[PDB]
Design a protein around this nucleic acid. Sequence first.
DNA 1: TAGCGTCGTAAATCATAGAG
DNA 2: ACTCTATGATTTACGACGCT
Lengths: 73, 77
Amino acid sequence: ARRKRRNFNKQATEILNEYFYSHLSNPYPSEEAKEELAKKCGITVSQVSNWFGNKRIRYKKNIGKFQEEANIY
Amino acid sequence: NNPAANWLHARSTRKKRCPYTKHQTLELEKEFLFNMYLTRDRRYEVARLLNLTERQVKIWFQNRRMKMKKINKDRAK
DNA sequence: TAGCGTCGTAAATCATAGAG
DNA sequence: ACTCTATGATTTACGACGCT
């Protein structure tokens, strides 16, 4: 059967958000850094690239909505 | 604070994205399989036929080759 | 320089998981 | 189940750099 898209588990999201926020002034992981995140999260490098693309634009589009999340991290 | 300040930004003069139609997509896909690399003339004819600029056609083919790369990387684990 | 190639990404849009 | 909308994925359009 075809693989279905799925929301990432809480674990993967925490790892990605951790990296994103710790590099907030320039959240652009290098290819080697995307491979390691991909490993810790159990996802693919394309998926890490998609997550960062999605995160930067949505965060940039709504700074307020992502506040508080910026702090806990 | 503006933490997004140093991030990559789209130049305020970039053409706004226009999804192509099922028809334009299907026709471009068929031109792709005929020759994965366009000649100045084939590009010119496909562009006219679909009412897309030659630039848009050149870029569509470039993006299509990157999609092929993406799919093949997804397969050869 | 002109001009087409790849790589990586921005931003908009898609598809449908999943949450009420 | 049945909307909605959140989120991962895909599609246009380029900038930066390669080479001839």
